[PDB]
């Protein structure tokens, strides 16, 4: 495959997030640390097993990529209500 | 007054908490710093007016004293 | 101290007053003082929440980040 | 590096590996290291702590990196 997969991605359906809280990862290796206030785009809410997990995969400004708690994050919301 | 006020204290009313994420104060002077899993005790939930607010002050483990937000704090419930 | 980048160079004033505790790398800080930030880094190489500034006197010291407030355009 | 407190004195196992950032030390799952402080070179609370590997290495870890034996 790609880096993203193998089928076209639509634009729109991209989410974004903004730390609550700052992360220190307890799995250097699969995690992402996070300062509050950090974007980040989610790319995906899967494990790496492929299961439905409250580990949410992201990439980070810095261009790092693991996973985050998710209630350690906002995802941002349309138009301006971020 | 004492270091908790005048009248005598119900002991079965201290309440106690545990810090859910690290915390660093954005006011030095008001808030006290904090490492999720920390232990504190809960002094007041009134801010310094008396009025109520997010904002309680504790007493960490350190014996430092000062504010912190409600919502990263977890108190602990009993046996 | 390090000759700094010019794209990292900022003025911070200060927020609230600071003693230092070890006047030994602590530098002395009055709420609304200007200072120049030296280094977002510790000792040893590596990012930390204790800056190093240069006082308006030419003192150099480090200083809780949360202290001070990068004067932006 | 200088006298312990036989209070302070700890032994953690590396949970994973760890290059070094030659200012520090290297680490690989399962070795044994004693942890000399939990400071910098300033004195102030810290993220990486010096450390003393099983060959005599000294230098500083990631403290999310290792865990308190015991």
Same mark, same amino acid.
């Given at each position: 495959?790609?880096?993203? +997969?193998?089928?076209?991605?639509d634009? &729109? /359906?991209?989410?974004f997030?903004?730390?609550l809280? %700052?992360?220190?990862?307890?799995?250097?290796?699969?995690?992402?640390?996070?300062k509050? +206030?950090d974007?980040?785009?989610?790319? &995906? /809410?899967?494990?790496?097993?492929?299961?439905?997990? %409250?580990?949410?995969?992201?990439?980070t400004?810095?261009?790092?990529?693991?996973?985050?708690?998710y209630?350690?994050?906002?995802?941002? /919301?349309?138009?301006?209500?971020?």
């Amino acid at each position: 495959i790609s880096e993203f +997969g193998s089928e076209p991605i639509d634009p &729109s /359906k991209l989410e974004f997030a903004r730390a609550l809280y %700052d992360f220190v990862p307890e799995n250097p290796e699969m995690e992402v640390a996070l300062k509050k +206030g950090d974007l980040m785009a989610i790319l &995906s /809410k899967k494990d790496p097993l492929g299961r439905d997990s %409250d580990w949410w995969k992201v990439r980070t400004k810095n261009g790092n990529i693991g996973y985050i708690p998710y209630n350690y994050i906002e995802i941002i /919301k349309r138009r301006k209500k971020i």
